[PDB]
């Protein structure tokens with residue numbers, strides 16, 4: 001009937017009726033393009049109540065095993081046949097099947113390598129894999145999670161890593177991290193109508209209160225890990241301050257910039273995505289890279305829906321703040337980016353300027369089309385929030401499609417959960 | 421088999437094979453998105469050899485007439501029936517049919533209003549329409565074209581206008597403007613391996629030489645109008661210097677900025693697009709708006725494939741030009757934008773800063789979803805080449821689809837032309 005459209009700024013909504021009068025055919029769909037949609041169902045993989053039908057779990061299983069053994073130079077044919085063999089057996093013996101650690105490792109880099117929205121895929125090979133497939137309880141998740149955070153933070157010399165938890169069996173014994181990301185600040189909707197901390201989190205920050213968390217009502221409070229294991233209920237876990245490393249924001253000129261008091265954690269880790277490989281699916285598997293300047297400087301510090309600091313950084317800059325055409329916004333935002341850039345470098349925290357990141361992507365793309373002729377790429381995501389055209393990737397045409405293995409999104413845990 | 425991908429920067433090409441292993445379904449197409457493609461066939465409308473099949477030319481004809489009469493408050497029912505009547509008759513009397521001037525006027529604003537890539541659609545109502553449907557020869561095109569340029573330039577107070585030429589009959593009597601745009605500089609691939617003027621034009625600039633134009637080998641030479649009428653051959657016409665208004669580039673601080681000697685015409689007019697309305701199609705119909713700062717400042721002055729001036733504007737700024745991470749590119753580009761902005765304002769030439777343009781679009785979108793529930797919008801095009809996230813439209817989800825009436829692209833004239 002109609003498509004819903006969200007404006008993540010005003011968070012307003014709209015119902016598109018008009019698109020029905022869509023003439024004939026478009027560039028990919030029968031007249032209609034939803035590439036501008038944030039979370040399309042096409043990239044999600046939701047809940048379940050029963051296991052995974054053998055007539056599928058098996059075809060996909062075989063496919064992966066081929067991709068796998070058909071990888072390393074000089075194939076181990078007997079093993080390729082051998083595995084396929086044991087695989088089938090195991091499948092037709094318990095329904096699902098288990099992966100060999102070398103497979104997981106393969107799966108994860110491939111999946112990562114297949115993330116159309118990632119721009120640092122040139123590193124797809126150097127990835128740490130933590131096998132937690134035999135985890136049992138919430139307390140054990142929380143333990144591996146700490147292990148992870150500690151490993152990737154490496155005191156500023158960030159390291160990409162992923163810690164794979166228990167795969168999905170039937171669908172009622174899922175392991176899920178309820179948070180959006182490993183480390184993330186909390187946002188309270190304080191009295192005076194204002195909002196402190198991270199306007200983004202708001203909702204989640206509440207659930208943490210409802211599940212019993214102590215809101216230290218501040219501007220940079222690292223939210224608690226809300227872990228649910230085996231399909232049980234989520235148990236709240238606060239993170240060891242000692243583990244969350246942060247950079248303090250200071251400009252290389254304007255000395256009044258530290259007066260703003262801003263800071264930000266140095267570890268970007270996606271917590272709620274889902275890995276799909278060989279017709280198997282792990283609903284819990286956090287992975288992390290490292291920041292790219294403008295993420296913090298332009299998205300987190302300068303968004304109507306986040307910390308929102310653009311104007312004030314301008315006022316303390318002179319700029320005719322009340323006259324759009326003056327380009328004060330353009331000037332301000334740029335210095336803020338020098339700040340975040342300056343700061344991490346000073347305090348020694350692996351970070352990357354958007355200009356060198358784009359160049360690095362292009363390289364990777366080359367090797368990737370040369371390597372396997374193709375490279376999934378969502379333009380809307382790979383081009384920086386600022387200075388787009390001044391970058392290589394902006395002028396680069398690209399095709400976006402889901403392959404496999406692959407990393408998917410998934411319905412918010414609290415929405416679909418049996419609170420026994 | 422495979423899809424071609426172009427990188428409009430290096431102009432390099434690639435063949436995407438991989439997309440075939442596309443899992444299942446995507447956000448719009450059966451796993452595959454080409455929204456990042458510049459000129460997809462979906463938005464083009466090409467050549468013909470025979471008239472337009474009555475079983476179509478008629479259904480579409482009726483559809484438009486309904487949209488039309490179903491527009492103005494308090495319908496002229498008898499006329500709505502009356503027209504539909506005369507329309508049918510005329511159609512079943514000569515094949516195609518003619519539009520009433522009020523229809524063209526309607527058609528054009530609707531078409532414009534339906535341009536998913538236009539960001540100034542909030543002006544869709546104030547548009548000047550010039551009826552040239554009875555033009556006959558090249559010399560007559562060249563005349564209306566001058567008329568047009570003169571009208572829209574209005575000595576700096578730019579005015580949106582469109583001059584509709586002879587519709588399409590069979591397909592061998594097409595009227596086409598061969599240039600990409602009314603006013604555009606020429607690019608010569610000079611001796612020393614360098615390139616002067618506009619690297620973009622290059623190819624076309626040659627054809628103008630081959631059709632007998634005198635290359636004044638400079639940095640800002642307005643190309644000649646290459647007009648072909650009735651399906652004949654293109655005749656070259658130089659433009660009256662007196663008509664092409666230009667702004668001289670000068671910074672409000674760095675006084676050495678005029679030393680660069682840069683300038684740019686104040687009239688943006690698309691020349692080669694095709695209007696489709698009521699199953700009719702006019703292959704020649706130039707329309708114009710007015711510039712939006714960053715078009716000149718970021719796309720034309722700062723592109724590996726255009727004038728390319730970013731570095732030098734930085735060197736004369738101090739900036740550590742050889743260290744990407746220094747953000748000199750970000751700083752430089754911004755001042756250049758102050759320049760182009762400063763300059764037009766000074767010299768009194770209707771221009772618009774990208775920040776107020778986005779705000780203005782959002783408004784329009786609101787009225788548009790409220791008006792007819794929907795608004796075709798190509799995100800990739802509506803979000804500025806710089807300071808994207810600092811704008812409203814970046815966070816706005818949107819649907820892109822072709823409606824009608826509508827403005828289409830079309831195969832380069834010289835590619836498909838009988839040179840008798």
Ligand code: HEM
Nearest residue numbers: 112115117118119120123160162287288289290291292407
């Ligand atoms: C080593 C350095 C890395 C860098 C600089 C990098 C950078 C980025 C950036 C800037 C984004 C966009 C985030 C946003 O728009 O909010 C992104 C997204 C993504 N990256 Fe990477 N990445 C790296 C490593 C990894 C690794 C190791 C994986 C997986 C194992 C990965 C998986 C993805 C996925 C799935 C997304 C999409 C996330 C989403 O849609 O929310 N990245 N990355």
Ligand code: HEM
Nearest residue numbers: 532535537538539540543580582707708709710711712827
């Ligand atoms: C009055 C002020 C106007 C402004 C500020 C405006 C601005 C723009 C801008 C910035 C673009 C992007 C160009 C590019 O990316 O190279 C664009 C595209 C477009 N506009 Fe508008 N526009 C205006 C009026 C009009 C009018 C009067 C029409 C038609 C009658 C129109 C039709 C379109 C079309 C078809 C495109 C797509 C052109 C293409 O794909 O190459 N615009 N406009």
Ligand SMILES: C[C@H](O)[C@H](O)[C@H]1CNc2nc(N)[nH]c(=O)c2N1
Nearest residue numbers: 394395396397456457458800801
């Ligand atoms: C590959 C890519 O689609 C291409 O560079 C596009 C991106 N968006 C654009 N948007 C606008 N307005 N104008 C352009 O020329 C382009 N180029």
Ligand SMILES: C[C@H](O)[C@H](O)[C@H]1CNc2nc(N)[nH]c(=O)c2N1
Nearest residue numbers: 036037038380381814815816817
């Ligand atoms: C509507 C729109 O799709 C949305 O704002 C997108 C655009 N591109 C993005 N690109 C990245 N990397 N990150 C984002 O959060 C967004 N937001």
Ligand SMILES: NC1=N[C@H](c2cccs2)Nc2cccc(F)c21
Nearest residue numbers: 181268269270288289290291292
């Ligand atoms: N840099 C990144 N941006 C977002 C995050 C921001 C904050 C936490 S995760 N997502 C990513 C996912 C994986 C690796 C990364 F490096 C990133």
Ligand SMILES: NC1=N[C@H](c2cccs2)Nc2cccc(F)c21
Nearest residue numbers: 302303304308309310311312313
């Ligand atoms: N109101 C404000 N808008 C800008 C914005 C930054 C990001 C989005 S809007 N900056 C500010 C900074 C400090 C205090 C403020 F009140 C503002």
Ligand SMILES: NC1=N[C@H](c2cccs2)Nc2cccc(F)c21
Nearest residue numbers: 601688689690708709710711712
């Ligand atoms: N501003 C514009 N940008 C491009 C052009 C750039 C140069 C000539 S046309 N296309 C448009 C088409 C119509 C009206 C406009 F305003 C524009």
Ligand SMILES: NC1=N[C@H](c2cccs2)Nc2cccc(F)c21
Nearest residue numbers: 722723724728729730731732733
């Ligand atoms: N080589 C150059 N690169 C930048 C670019 C501008 C736009 C794209 S690259 N600017 C320059 C300006 C002057 C002379 C130059 F040689 C350059």
Ligand SMILES: [Zn+2]
Nearest residue numbers: 033035453455
């Ligand atoms: Zn699409």
